[model samples]
Target: GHMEGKNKFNTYVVSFDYPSSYSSVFLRLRSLMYDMNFSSIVADEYGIPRQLNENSFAITTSLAASEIEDLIRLKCLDLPDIDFDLNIMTVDDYFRQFYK
Candidate 1:
């Protein structure tokens, strides 16, 4: 689908489920973000999703959907054992998905 001009480069949210108990998970994720040079905001464990536990988080990035997917795939290359279920969606679509 084609996006509007304004939406062409808007922020996208990539939500996912990961293992909070994994000792190096946080460090690895952070490093991945830095290596990819993508800005992100991860929610605290206090109010994270219930089903996915505190490990559930979302990342907001300027990268487009395809770029985000590629980044995730590359980041996971060395840590294939680390489980993740990622959901990439536009920021606007995320709000609409939950609110509407």
Candidate 2:
């Protein structure tokens, strides 16, 4: 998990690849935080390779393992079925299941 070298102590950058036709905001894994349920959101770019997810940001200071637990324990959404067209739940209903 730790990247190499003394010079690169606690810094990192991450990238994401999205579909070419996919527009609208895509959520990055890093943005989820429990402390300030003040959910953070970011925008994505249009066209081409669909480079970097804007949601990911930098972290400075030497973070201790205990303090990073919240960040590490973040959960992702799990839809029931793989069929996109057969999605029975509404967008609002899907998110409400988690939000409520």
Candidate 3:
């Protein structure tokens, strides 16, 4: 995870099943991104992703989609009372449903 954002790649649509009003959830995710060496934590930079809907957003980093997915699974493997459901998908797959 060295060099942080250097040589970055991949855009994953990270989001939960709940609504987007929960600021803490966003913060939580952002913090987790730090562990994965997120290039841009929170910003509308050139490759930074924005909210695509009420409960989803896109993010690009050095880690690939599967990597992110596995990491999350490792971090939050056990269930909790204040729970959440994260839905992850590649940006290409998220939008490709319309062109066929």
Candidate 4:
């Protein structure tokens, strides 16, 4: 169970390999989230570059663990070069590190 105010939010980081010239993967993920009406967290590329290179980039979203996994399964599971990292913690925890 999560606290309603701040603890309810969960942070997810999904990194994958995709073509930079054509951002279909990222677009698809974004569209899918919108279609599912899932609230997403827009991450700033501060120390982390969203686009790692011509063939790699990273995405972050705020959703339950199940939602995150389901999103990956439905949209990215079969991509030739796709993988992700997830961070599960309170929203406050994320902001603390985010501010620091």
Candidate 5:
């Protein structure tokens, strides 16, 4: 998988199963994000990711909740908007599933 010049935001994918309850959906998303240690990471400008790098320092980590939120708000986000009947796939969801 060669990304060439692709950055983290352009490389990672986010996807998940849409629960019946919206709250459940949110919790599931948060769980996925938090579980991926996103709670400890944040997004940087240029849409590149930055994390602790296992050295306990904010060097270059995955995208943060704030960045994810920005993507949604900007409406320029997409990993693969596929209709799986029981699933609602998005870049953020796929990113969580694959990376986290």
Candidate 6:
């Protein structure tokens, strides 16, 4: 279990390939976490190739992983340019990285 304040939290590692122009997609992810929703989102991007998901971010959420996934899918509406991927982890699963 989680040794935090609440146990209803989760960590989502997201990886996707879009572009600087479609930066709207970029903001959406950051915005979703900041619609007054207290979530931690940190992006780690390199150049073009991020097969290992180096172009990814670690996000914390209290909603369903699928819910988070759908929000990205639905909000963006349609975009064939994105090769998005999300790796979900619970506190019980991976907490070492969360703390120092």
- lDDT score at residue 42, model 4, on the 0-100 scale: 38
lDDT of 2 at 54: 43
Off by over 4 Å in 4: 1-23, 40-67, 77-81
TM-score for every candidate vs. truth? 0.53, 0.25, 0.45, 0.39, 0.23, 0.41
Judging by lDDT, tell me the better candidate of 2 and 5. Answer: 5
TM-score, candidate number 6? 0.41
Tens digits of lDDT, candidate 5, 8-96: 64323333333344543354434444444233344444354545223121212345545654543333122223221222233344334
- Show where candidate 6 strays beyond 4 Å: 1-6, 36-54, 77-100
Cα deviation of 26, candidate 3, in Å: 6.2
Query: What is the C-alpha lDDT profile of model 6 across 43-75, one tens digit per residue?
Result: 323222212223444456667767766766675
Candidate achieving higher lDDT, 1 or 5: 1
Shift in Å, residue 72, candidate 1: 1.2
Model 2 reaches what TM-score against the true structure? 0.25
Off by over 4 Å in 1: 1-8, 41-67, 97-100
The lDDT of model 1 is 0.56
* Model 2: pairs clashing at backbone N, Cα or C within 3 Å: none
Per residue, candidate 3 scores C-alpha lDDT tens digits across 1-100 of 6666666666666655644465555566555654564434322333444445445556775566666767765665332322556777766665554232
What is candidate 1's lDDT per residue for 20-62, written digit by digit as tens?
6754665676567556644444323343332212232344456
User: Which residues of candidate 2, in runs, are more than 4 Å off?
Assistant: 1-9, 20-25, 28-30, 33-56, 61-74, 78-100
Stretches off by above 4 angstroms in model 3 are: 1-8, 19-50, 70-81, 98-100
**Candidates ranked, most accurate by lDDT first:** 1, 3, 6, 4, 5, 2
Residue-level error in angstroms, candidate 6, position 39? 5.2
Q: Output the number of the TM-score-best candidate.
A: 1
Rank ordering of all candidates by TM-score, starting from the highest: 1, 3, 6, 4, 2, 5
Candidate 3 lDDT score relative to the true structure = 0.55
